[PDB]
Nucleic acid binder design. Structure first.
Ligand SMILES: [Mg+2]
Ligand SMILES: [Zn+2]
Ligand SMILES: [Zn+2]
Ligand SMILES: [Zn+2]
Lengths: 158, 559, 43, 264, 160, 196, 141, 133, 114, 49, 86, 65
RNA sequence: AUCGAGAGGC
């Protein structure tokens, strides 16, 4: 269930509960139409790429698919009305905050991702120190140097 | 590789480092003499001119000062040797090489530069003594230690350069690590142990302690919190005064082990609107861990609030620890006599198992498991038996160790210490290993000349029954030294191998950047990936999310 | 002074590791951490 | 007698005095201890000029040793800080000038005890600058050892000072502080292997306070007003004068704060 | 191996399963053998997985082994970085080593190429081949001492 | 450094009044963190504290020799005979306030060594300075008042931040920036320039 | 007289040694728990007995106090530190003119010393001071 | 501005949960079989012996910076021997028509369950608790 | 080399008043005073004696850095009661207690015979 | 206390360091690598006394 | 070569300012302010050129255009006023 | 090299003691701890200064110049 | 300037 994705819904939900001081006993101000159509419109509102052409639009949809699944899971009409009582104002605020956080979460153009990736792999390797499998720094050396001959080849059979 | 990719540079400095609890995290304790040597060029403006004049008046030898002045013609004026250090009149557009001053952008670096975190912008804090001085929380990105580690400082020389350092390289900005999608820096050492001790339910603080602690917080509201206990004596929980440091609007939920909402253990953490409801603060709550308080404060409040949060938590917790105190002694390592006798009988039972398996092997009754030598199977069985004995004795010691024992307390806070440390210090260090197996017979069919030939007993093969407290025997000492020698050899070789690995990795991926189309590309233009990370997202912003739809019964999903 | 006057250097299939035959003929502990760890030992 | 802090001196000598500081608040006891350690003025050498040194020891070594030597500072309040008098470098109301000269005439090693030091400055009738001698032999602190054919000659200018500027000017060695010997306040949580009582030795002062009773509950209101102290003197100032001058120095600091308010 | 498999009710539940582990690898022969699931078979060697199952499977295996190396110590690295390295090796047809032969050999700039290893040979062949360097690469600019087209240097700035 | 591998440096110097004190008035010459102890398993440091305390009170030497049947319990028995806690813990009072320290503190004499490493030699700072002739780059070492190397690894670290202008200023104006004249038709710095 | 012999590494392979003279004693329960557990040798036909096990250690390791109770890497580190430790290197230092020399003002013999230290002359020419040390959390420095 | 709830309980059990100064207490309301109370209490300030029966009260008041209460001239609102200040963390329905309220007095934890307090003990920042022996 | 002169710990520098009084911002009837060239010795006593007065609501001292000899005292009092007056009364009470201690100790010492 | 063992060259006390080396005139059998034409090798290092 | 420019309409680059973009704009503005250049924002107790540049960024008063570059070589120009900072 | 004037921990003068202490061990064959107790040193911090001291002055004296 | 050696950090 737990995987790394941008934007934290749980914190936004608690922030809405505290900020607008939601009380549970009052019934909501939100029509079902509003909740469902707003979730769909928000899905249209989170943007990673801006292109008009259909291949870029498909790339955007493919990139945002898993995040949209998370949104649909947490922004469910039964949950939004029952699990955490939500006035209309709080729900619109949640939509706005989700969109803003997502737009902040996009990588900035001009970032040197390759150098950062090399450093990010290198630092834990320096920490590595120490049942017959090639592991750790020797395994990493084999992997990087595309070693034709391996100390511990193996086949797992299912 | 040595004169173009890297080069010696001006405006650089190096010095031994020590840590200031009272120094701010982004601040760096630049010594006064180093500031007297280092110069930043400042063009004279109507806004600054007065200060600049006084600086030139103050002179190069006493700081704040300036070493040189640059005219429009460009002829340098050396304040140290000039008849005109006193009569100077600064025409507009002239340059002053001012000394490095407080709250100036600099770069702080530790020489294993495996991270963007290893070179970070810092704020100048001119200090009397000669050491470079830094906050405790900044050690982790550098991996710095105060055993004698030296660190380097580089001074920007242009406004754009200073702007780049301040706007991108600042310590608060790098608090969340793009690698590992988690914070780099957290609460360490005394602050951590003291935060655990203070957060305990039994810990209560009186009005004097509360009052000074409240003042110690720089951004304190001026409102004394209502005491947790009011009737018999006005008393405050450590959690309340700790909450005073937590910024408002911060909510944290953590459930571990038997984390009932009643939470008898005081386990787990619940924080609402900057106040802690229940729990004991420890490394998971307050460390660099994912879902840590640092992560939340950096993401909602902002980086600056989180840096100030580091400072305030350190100040309060260090004050309370200083007046409460902490220590570690031999008695912490000592365990009960009944526990000791149970440990020694456990070791003896493992020895009996080894002897019986050995005798069965001598009768050839033992059957080899498929794919392994019969001798290989014997070695595996004996090694496992002895490792289990060591672990069991250590666990017995951990049970015996009281809540007052300080090694246990460091472990609970997580500042230093592990199960293995207690096991080896009090019960049994265990069996050492060289190149994978138990110690071999360098001599003929015998590991040491004192042993008889053809002996595979744990004593002959390098299992050290005794503990560090108990005292290693001579033979045990030699075998332990063999193991430690292998450890040092492996360390020395591993550093070089990892350095080569990192250099090759960096050289391969150095050209890779995210272009404006979001395509990851190189100088040739070849697209390594069309969307960076396949989602186009910065990993520091990314956090762990639970997807409820994937799991659960279909009936529960429906309901 | 004494340690320098009692020192051995081995110019250079597992030399660095402490060997059982090194029992009482060299110090198990004394050796310089770094490239020469185990190559240089004290008597 | 007079209401307020009440003292009862259990035992006393010129070097050690032992008392019970009853009916005082803790902050006062701590502050008085700090003032005694640091803030009481005393005369000690702050300048040594060596004309001749044939000793094996270096000059700075001997200068540090000379700084450590104890000298009488009873009338030090009459003496004026060299930074507080108008002397160009030093004068008679600010500094005490001493000279030392020793040659190893004897074939055996000739020692240089602190009794060998003599005064060149004009005293003006104050009990100041006499090296403290507690040795039964009457010889002072052994400054240096001189073989035959070896000599040393120097001049030391002793000045008024405070221990916060250097430890030599400190008048007290080791001050013993104890409160709540039965730990009725529970100010410290004992670390025990099996039982705290057997593991932790009884304090002598424990006998003065009445023993705890197991039945009674902890008194939250109770605070420590009774303190047990022992003061040791190096001899530059007597013990009674040490404690009294510490009291007066602290009250002088407080009065300076009040006067600064009035000026403001 | 303990495994998690959907129960008929839908909740994921334990599925203990017998699994074999072999000292050697001849994958092309092993998958065709009956009694096994050819879909789930895994070779630790990337090169055999790549030759048998194509390059994409090799990319996945490359990542899987790197992740195992990181996870044995308990360390975590985000998918993007390890992935990026895997891509850099995988994109150019086959697995490309992070060595002199492999990644350093490329149409990349001659100065960037010479910065890694075999400096003078690369420069000599560039002189003979009459290669022209676009100077797009960072190391070329660092040698050139000019602001790299990197971060702040990516975008030109002009008056409004 | 201690005799058991415990390296360290002075973070601060504290006067005797500020330092914690025992009831006897004994003040610690040196303060070490507990945290360094559990990770390195330097038990003998603790044992030496105990044995040196017992020896100092006894007026006899302490046998720290290896492979000697000296038990911690026996040394603790002697210490208890001398009126201190067996494990060396001592009640201590905060110097700043005079309040009793909640934790009893491990206090004892321990042999320590002044290592050859002292700050003022290590301290170095250049700003502008002398330059080596062939490279036109800064000279090397404190002794020559040289300039610290900006490592290629450090340069990669800077690239990770993207501060291109800082890298260029560090690598050109700070070290070896130079002006040359070239001709496009030559393509090389064959140009002979009479500037004045 | 033949009471002692010189044995090299290759000659050792034929010989059997006992650590303690007390090993070659008749064998017959109640023991101090704190004493280190020593294996009964279960051996006879000893050719020789070791002079003292502590003789395996070098000069720097013999300086180390209670090395049997510490992990080996720390002992190696300290053995590297004694070379760095300041002290009275020789008595003739005032006569001698070395490029650099450092000497403690008030050298102190250690309170806890090895037996081997006697032959090392460390007590005669020490390199450290027996500082009163407190292990405590204080001021965070 | 007035008392929110009051009852009288008898302590089922007292448990020192690895704490020297604090014991967890579980108690049942006398005269009511539908109401139970768990609460962490500092025993040193107020001894809480088992089988004792204690009066318990929760009031909204009687914010601005806390001040020492003069010499008691400001009227005590507490005949009770023990008093704490806390904020309620969770409100749960044990069963339909049956409520439970979770309070936290700076770390000492309370749970109170019954059906009576439907109109009082609302979620609030302020909830003074007052216990009389 | 870089170390400060020790006299700075007890000697006031150029242009440095022993007390500087500044109103607290966002806190009513509160003042922060910077005692230069002073240590825990003075601050702890001032704070405790301030606590004994009922009118003082807040009294605390903080040492912003162990390097530097300065300490900050913040005082909050009831309205109409000047914190400066509270400081004066506390200091004077300390002085009277010290004088009484001096007299009682003199009596006790004169009784003592050794 | 000085024990000697060093030479004085140009006023500098230079100490000779011992060199470790494999004994000559010793016969030892060394298995060749598995991918090698020859399975085993016996080596002696013959030097005059 | 000639007129290899994306029209302002149909520009697909991110409207939001990149961190590097803001940093370089602020640095250039701070440099010009430091070299006696006029300031287009009223200053209330600011003397630092960088602080002035930040205030100008809040005003959106800084006249400059960020020329985002693409691998094909085509360039998209966004004025500071068009760009969104967050 | 020579006996410290004062204990670094207390500050109590110890320069008076040394010679007597030596004579006390030689004259009456005292135990070193008993000699320390007679010399007025009852605290281990000041005691270490007399026990741990090795008087290197004597060797320095033996050198003729 | 080279060469060589020793030490410090991870
Ligand atoms: Mg380190
Ligand atoms: Zn004068
Ligand atoms: Zn041409
Ligand atoms: Zn002493």
């Amino acid at each position: 269930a737990n995987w790394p994705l941008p934007v934290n819904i749980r914190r936004i939900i608690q922030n809405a509960q505290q900020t607008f001081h939601i009380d549970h006993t009052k019934p909501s101000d939100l029509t079902i139409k509003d909740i469902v159509l707003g979730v769909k419109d928000l899905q249209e509102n989170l943007l990673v790429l801006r292109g008009k052409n259909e291949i870029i639009q498909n790339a955007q949809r493919d990139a945002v698919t898993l995040f949209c699944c998370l949104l649909r899971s947490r922004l469910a009409t039964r949950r939004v009305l029952q699990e955490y009582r939500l006035t209309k104002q709080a729900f619109d605020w949640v939509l706005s905050n989700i969109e803003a956080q997502f737009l902040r979460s996009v990588v900035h153009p001009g970032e040197m991702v390759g150098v950062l990736a090399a450093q990010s792999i290198g630092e834990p390797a320096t920490q590595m120190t120490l049942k017959k499998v090639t592991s750790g720094v020797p395994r990493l050396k084999e992997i990087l140097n595309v070693a034709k001959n391996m100390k511990t080849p193996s086949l797992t059979v299912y | 590789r040595g004169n173009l990719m890297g080069k010696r540079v001006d405006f650089s400095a190096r010095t031994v480092i020590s840590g200031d609890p009272n120094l701010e995290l982004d601040q760096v304790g630049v010594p006064k003499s180093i500031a007297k040597t280092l110069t930043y060029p400042e063009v004279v403006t109507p806004y600054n001119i007065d200060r600049l004049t006084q600086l030139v008046r103050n002179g190069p030898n006493e700081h704040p000062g300036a070493k040189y002045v640059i005219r429009d013609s460009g002829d340098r004026i050396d304040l140290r040797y000039s008849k005109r250090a006193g009569d100077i009149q600064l025409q507009y557009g002239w340059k002053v090489e001012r000394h490095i001053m407080d709250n100036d952008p600099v770069l702080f670096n530790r020489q294993p530069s495996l991270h963007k975190m290893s070179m970070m912008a810092h704020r100048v804090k001119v200090i009397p003594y000669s050491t470079f001085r830094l906050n405790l929380s900044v050690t982790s990105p550098y991996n710095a230690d105060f055993d004698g580690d030296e660190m380097n400082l580089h001074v920007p020389q242009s406004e754009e350069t200073r702007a780049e350092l301040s706007q991108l390289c600042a310590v608060p900005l790098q608090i969340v690590s793009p690698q590992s999608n988690k914070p780099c820096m957290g609460i360490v050492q005394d602050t951590l142990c003291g935060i655990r001790k203070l957060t305990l339910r039994d810990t209560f603080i009186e009005l004097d302690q509360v009052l000074n602690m409240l003042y110690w917080v720089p951004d304190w509201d001026g409102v004394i919190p209502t005491p947790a206990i009011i009737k018999p004596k006005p008393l405050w929980s450590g959690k309340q005064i700790l909450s005073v440091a937590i910024p408002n609007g911060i909510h944290l939920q953590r459930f571990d082990e038997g984390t009932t909402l009643l939470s008898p253990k005081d386990n787990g953490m619940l924080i609402i609107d900057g106040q802690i409801i229940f729990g004991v603060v420890e490394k998971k709550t307050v460390g660099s861990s994912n879902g840590g308080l640092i992560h939340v404060v950096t993401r909602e409040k902002g980086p600056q609030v989180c840096a100030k949060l580091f400072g305030n938590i350190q100040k309060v917790v260090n004050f309370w620890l200083l007046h409460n105190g902490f220590s570690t002694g031999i008695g912490d390592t000592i365990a009960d006599g009944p526990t000791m006798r149970e440990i020694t009988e456990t070791i003896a039972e493992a020895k009996k198992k080894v002897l019986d398996v050995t005798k069965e092997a001598q009768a050839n009754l033992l059957t080899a498991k498929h794919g392994m030598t019969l001798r290989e199977s014997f070695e595996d069985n004996v090694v496992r038996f002895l490792n289990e004995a060591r672990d069991k004795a250590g666990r017995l010691a951990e049970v015996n160790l009281k809540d007052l024992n300080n090694v246990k307390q460091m472990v609970m806070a997580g500042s230093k210490g592990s199960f293995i440390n207690i096991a080896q210090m009090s019960a049994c260090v265990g069996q050492q290993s060289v190149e994978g197996k138990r110690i071999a017979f360098g001599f003929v069919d015998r590991t040491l000349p004192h042993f008889s030939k053809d002996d595979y007993s744990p004593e002959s093969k390098g299992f050290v029954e005794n503990s560090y407290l108990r005292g290693l025997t001579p033979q045990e000492f030699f075998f332990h030294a063999m193991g430690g020698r292998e450890g040092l050899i492996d360390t020395a070789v591993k550093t070089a191998e990892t350095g080569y690995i990192q250099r090759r990795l960096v050289k391969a991926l150095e050209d890779i950047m995210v272009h404006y189309d979001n395509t990851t590309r190189n100088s040739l233009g070849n697209v390594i990936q069309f969307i960076y990370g396949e989602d186009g997202m910065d990993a520091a912003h990314i956090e762990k999310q639970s997807l409820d739809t994937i799991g659960g019964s279909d009936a529960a999903f429906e309901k | 002074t004494l340690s320098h006057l009692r020192r051995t250097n081995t110019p250079i299939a597992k030399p660095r590791q402490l060997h059982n035959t090194h029992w009482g003929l060299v110090c198990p502990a004394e050796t310089p951490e770094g490239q020469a760890c185990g190559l240089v030992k004290n008597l | 007698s007079e209401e307020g802090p009440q003292v009862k001196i259990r035992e006393a000598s010129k070097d050690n005095v032992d008392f019970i500081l009853s009916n005082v608040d803790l902050a006062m006891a701590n502050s008085l201890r700090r003032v005694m350690i640091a803030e009481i003025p005393t005369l000690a050498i702050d300048s040594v000029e060596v004309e001749t040194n044939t000793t094996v020891l270096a000059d700075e070594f001997i200068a540090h040793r000379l700084g450590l030597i104890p000298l009488q500072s009873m009338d030090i309040e009459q003496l004026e800080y060299s930074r507080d008098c108008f002397c160009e470098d030093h004068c008679d109301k600010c500094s005490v000038v001493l000279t030392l000269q020793a040659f190893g005439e004897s074939e055996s090693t000739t020692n240089v005890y602190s009794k060998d030091l003599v005064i060149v400055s004009n005293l003006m009738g104050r009990n100041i600058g006499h090296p403290i001698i507690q040795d039964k032999e009457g010889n002072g602190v052994l400054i240096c050892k001189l073989r035959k054919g070896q000599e040393l000659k120097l001049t030391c200018v002793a000045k008024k000072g405070i221990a916060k500027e250097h430890a030599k000017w400190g008048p007290a060695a080791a001050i013993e502080f104890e409160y709540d010997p039965w730990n009725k306040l529970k100010h410290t949580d004992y670390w025990y292997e099996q039982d705290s009582a057997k593991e932790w030795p009884q304090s002598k002062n424990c006998e003065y306070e009445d023993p705890p009773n197991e039945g009674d509950p902890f008194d939250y209101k109770a605070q420590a007003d009774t303190f047990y102290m022992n003061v040791e003197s190096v001899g530059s100032i007597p013990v009674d004068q040490v404690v009294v001058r510490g009291i007066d120095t602290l009250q002088k600091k407080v009065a300076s704060i009040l006067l600064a308010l009035t000026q403001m | 191996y303990d495994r998690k498999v959907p129960s008929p009710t839908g909740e994921y539940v334990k599925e203990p399963e017998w699994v074999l582990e072999t000292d050697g690898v001849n994958l092309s022969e092993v998958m065709t053998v009956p009694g096994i699931d050819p879909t789930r078979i895994y070779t630790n060697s990337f090169i055999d997985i790549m030759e048998v199952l194509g390059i994409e499977a090799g990319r996945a295996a490359l990542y899987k082994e790197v992740y195992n190396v990181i996870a044995s110590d308990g360390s975590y690295v985000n998918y993007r970085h390890m992935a990026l390295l895997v891509d850099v090796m995988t994109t150019q047809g086959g697995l490309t080593s992070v060595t002199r032969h492999g990644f350093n050999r490329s149409n990349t700039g001659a100065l960037m190429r010479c910065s890694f290893e075999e400096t003078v040979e690369i420069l000599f062949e560039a002189g003979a081949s009459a290669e022209l360097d676009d100077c797009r690469g960072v190391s070329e600019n660092v040698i050139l001492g000019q602001m790299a087209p990197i971060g702040t240097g990516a975008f030109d700035v002009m008056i409004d | 450094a201690s005799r058991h591998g415990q390296k360290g440096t002075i973070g601060i110097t504290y006067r005797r009044e500020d330092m914690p004190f025992t009831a006897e008035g004994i003040v610690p010459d040196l303060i070490i963190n507990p945290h360094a102890i559990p990770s390195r398993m330097t038990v003998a440091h603790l044992i030496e504290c105990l044995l040196s305390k017992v020896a100092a009170l006894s007026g006899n030497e302490g046998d720290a020799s290896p492979f000697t049947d000296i038990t911690v319990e026996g040394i603790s028995k002697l210490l208890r005979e001398h009126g201190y806690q067996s494990r060396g813990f001592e009640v201590m009072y905060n110097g700043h306030t005079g309040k009793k320290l909640m934790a009893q503190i491990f206090f004892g004499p321990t042999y320590y060594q002044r290592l050859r490493h002292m700050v003022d030699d290590k301290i170095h700072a250049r700003a502008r300075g002398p330059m080596q002739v062939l490279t036109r780059q800064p000279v090397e070492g404190r002794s020559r008042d040289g300039g610290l190397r900006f490592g290629e690894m450090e340069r990669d670290c800077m690239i990770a931040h993207g501060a291109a202008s800082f890298l260029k200023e560090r690598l050109m104006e700070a070290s070896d920036a130079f002006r040359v004249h070239i001709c496009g038709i030559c393509g090389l710095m064959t140009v002979i320039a009479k500037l004045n | 007289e033949g009471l002692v012999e010189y044995i090299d590494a290759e000659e050792e392979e034929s010989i059997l040694i006992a650590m303690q003279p007390e090993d070659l004693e008749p064998a017959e329960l109640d023991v101090d728990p704190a004493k280190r557990i020593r294996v009964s040798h279960h051996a006879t036909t000893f050719t020789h007995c070791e002079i003292h096990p502590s003789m395996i250690l070098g000069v720097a390791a013999s300086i180390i106090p209670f090395p049997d109770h510490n992990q080996s890497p720390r002992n190696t580190y300290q053995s590297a530190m004694g070379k760095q430790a300041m002290g009275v290197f020789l008595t003739n230092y005032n006569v001698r003119m070395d490029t650099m020399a450092n000497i403690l003002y008030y050298p102190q013999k250690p309170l806890g010393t090895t037996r081997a230290m006697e032959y090392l002359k460390f007590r005669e020419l020490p390199a450290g001071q027996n500082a009163i040390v407190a292990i405590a959390c204080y001021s965070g420095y | 501005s007035n008392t929110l709830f009051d009852d009288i309980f008898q302590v089922s059990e007292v448990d020192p949960g690895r704490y020297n100064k604090v014991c967890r207490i579980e108690a049942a309301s006398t005269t009511q079989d539908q109401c139970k109370l768990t609460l962490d209490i500092n025993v040193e300030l107020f001894p809480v012996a088992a089988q004792d029966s204690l009066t318990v009260t929760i009031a909204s008041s009687l914010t601005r910076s806390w001040r020492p209460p003069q010499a008691g001239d400001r009227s005590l609102a507490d005949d009770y021997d023990y008093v704490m200040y806390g904020t309620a963390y969770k409100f749960e329905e044990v069963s339909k028509d049956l409520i439970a309220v979770y309070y936290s007095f700076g770390g000492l934890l309370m749970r109170l369950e019954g059906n009576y307090r439907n109109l009082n003990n609302l979620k609030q920042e302020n909830a003074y608790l007052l216990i009389r022996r | 080399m870089n170390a400060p002169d020790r006299f700075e710990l007890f000697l006031l520098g150029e242009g440095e008043s022993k007390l500087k009084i500044d109103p607290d911002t966002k806190a009513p009837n509160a003042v922060v005073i910077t005692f230069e060239k002073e240590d825990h010795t003075l601050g702890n006593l001032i704070r405790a004696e301030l606590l004994n007065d009922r009118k003082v609501l807040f009294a605390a001292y903080k040492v912003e850095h162990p390097f530097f000899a300065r300490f900050k005292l913040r005082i909050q009092t009831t309205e109409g009661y000047d914190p400066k007056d509270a400081l004066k009364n506390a200091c004077n009470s300390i002085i009277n207690k010290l004088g009484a201690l001096k007299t009682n100790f003199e009596t006790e010492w004169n009784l003592q015979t050794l | 206390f000085d024990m000697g063992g060093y030479f004085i060259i140009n006023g500098s006390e230079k100490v000779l360091i011992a060199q470790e080396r494999s004994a000559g005139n010793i016969v030892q059998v060394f298995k060749k690598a598995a991918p090698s034409p020859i399975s085993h090798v016996a080596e002696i290092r013959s030097a005059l006394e | 070569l000639k007129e290899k420019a994306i029209p302002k309409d149909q520009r697909a680059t991110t409207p939001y300012m990149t961190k590097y973009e803001r940093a370089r704009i602020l640095g250039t503005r701070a440099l010009q302010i430091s070299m006696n250049a006029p300031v287009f924002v009223d200053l209330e107790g600011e003397t630092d050129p960088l602080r002035i540049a930040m205030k100008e960024l809040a005003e959106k008063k800084i006249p400059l255009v960020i020329r985002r570059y693409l691998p094909d070589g085509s360039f998209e120009d966004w004025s500071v006023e068009e760009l969104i900072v967050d | 090299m020579i006996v410290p004037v004062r204990c670094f921990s207390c500050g109590k003068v110890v320069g008076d003691k040394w010679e007597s202490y030596l004579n006390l061990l030689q004259e009456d064959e005292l135990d070193e701890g008993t000699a320390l107790s007679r010399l007025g040193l009852k605290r281990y911090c000041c005691r270490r200064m007399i026990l741990t001291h090795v008087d290197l002055i004597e060797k320095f004296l033996r050198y003729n110049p």
